[PDB]
Design a protein around this ligand. Sequence first.
Ligand SMILES: CN(CCS)C(=O)c1cccc(Br)c1
Ligand SMILES: CN(CCS)C(=O)c1cccc(Br)c1
Ligand SMILES: [Cl-]
Ligand SMILES: [Cl-]
Ligand SMILES: [Mg+2]
Ligand SMILES: [Mg+2]
Ligand SMILES: [Mg+2]
Ligand SMILES: [Mg+2]
Lengths: 235, 235, 7, 7
Amino acid sequence: AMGSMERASLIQKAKLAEQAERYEDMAAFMKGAVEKGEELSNEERNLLSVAYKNVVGGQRAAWRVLSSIEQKSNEEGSEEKGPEVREYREKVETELQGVCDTVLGLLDSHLIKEAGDAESRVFYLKMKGDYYRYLAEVATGDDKKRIIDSARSAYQEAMDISKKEMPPTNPIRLGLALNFSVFHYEIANSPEEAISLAKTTFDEAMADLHTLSEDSYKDSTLIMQLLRDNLTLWT
Amino acid sequence: AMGSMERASLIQKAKLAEQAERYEDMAAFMKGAVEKGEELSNEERNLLSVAYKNVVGGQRAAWRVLSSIEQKSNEEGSEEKGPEVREYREKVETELQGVCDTVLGLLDSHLIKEAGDAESRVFYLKMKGDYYRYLAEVATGDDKKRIIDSARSAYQEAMDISKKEMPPTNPIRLGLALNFSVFHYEIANSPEEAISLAKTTFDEAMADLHTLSEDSYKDSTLIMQLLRDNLTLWT
Amino acid sequence: RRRKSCQ
Amino acid sequence: RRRKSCQ
Ligand SMILES: CN(CCS)C(=O)c1cccc(Br)c1
Ligand SMILES: CN(CCS)C(=O)c1cccc(Br)c1
Ligand SMILES: [Cl-]
Ligand SMILES: [Cl-]
Ligand SMILES: [Mg+2]
Ligand SMILES: [Mg+2]
Ligand SMILES: [Mg+2]
Ligand SMILES: [Mg+2]
């Protein structure tokens, strides 16, 4: 639907959509921009991520509300209310899965394969892990283990690159570690791995802060605080 | 699209959508319920109103953000950025107008004509005034005066019924007066009428509070405070 | 401080 | 208090 709009206009409108808190539009504009076939700049990658994270974040929050209602509905003592709660949870779930499949499709066609610098490759592999993780959150069938493994594999490749090519304070490296740690805690039933990863990441970043400018220090310490928040919650 | 779903299931799913803050879905479910052709109960009218007010409220907020950017773009000294801001404002505007036309279409086919009790008729005529008011907010062409007059006429009919058939503390009557007062202030360039209406409404409600139960008192005083908030802002 | 309408 | 991921 965006094929007839200039790439630059799509990027401009994505920024306008962000200002207007129109995240579905923002995501559609950024999808159109990706489909032009050119690589994304750092700013453009961040627009893509903001757009889809906001869209899928609203879907995930709604899914959790509906899943909780459905769970209460299937407690013994609860009255039969019919198929409607399940149906509507399934509707939201299918829409969520569709968004995740769309993002994964953009990464596979062809953002990852064209991404050679560590900053872009780690960013996209982190995103791949994230959207498989969101699929894993709602998965219950025969492919659930494979979905979890797909998330793990993408995160692991991103981690391996990030450790070799980025400093321990790099915000992309830190955000990847944060999310992989959440994967371990919430998805893979590995709370000790989650805690170890968060603590090692935090400590290695702390030791590298002395190399940073004031502005970089602010960026890195912000994400370190997210790691600390999780460590405080989990221990 | 909702023709194959039971009326009761649509209402149930509208309530689930509300809990999940999925207001577009909520509105689609309530549209489907209206299109079953039966009158709406008090609760169902409120679900219809909540759903569409939230949908159009997000559109109006986005339109105002974009309109402000467009206005700044056409200040002398500003750089030419191309047609994109106007195009995107127009896109949001057209979607907003479409929602308003949908609501007005439901009211015209056939909610208003079947509404005989004051509580339903005033409610629907207030809604008609509101959605014409939202159309007036974005109107700039040859029909703008007619759109404003359509809002005025619907509000006036609702006011006439409300004064004859409802007590001055009735929450529907109060919310209608609040919104008609905003119409006068913001749309019709009649701030004195807006102030007079808000003050007369507030004072007449105050004098009737003594007749009310504690729960009704809470309902009425909440809307009276909205009238007072506007009077404080406007004087 | 935006004026109030009936929400 | 929901755990943090990278927003
Ligand atoms: C408190 N409150 C909202 C502010 S007015 C109401 O009771 C209400 C709601 C919908 C429609 C109408 Br009319 C009135
Ligand atoms: C602060 N912040 C978000 C919390 S991690 C980031 O810098 C960021 C943003 C997007 C992707 C990645 Br990776 C990192
Ligand atoms: Cl459904
Ligand atoms: Cl557009
Ligand atoms: Mg390349
Ligand atoms: Mg490097
Ligand atoms: Mg009737
Ligand atoms: Mg009466």
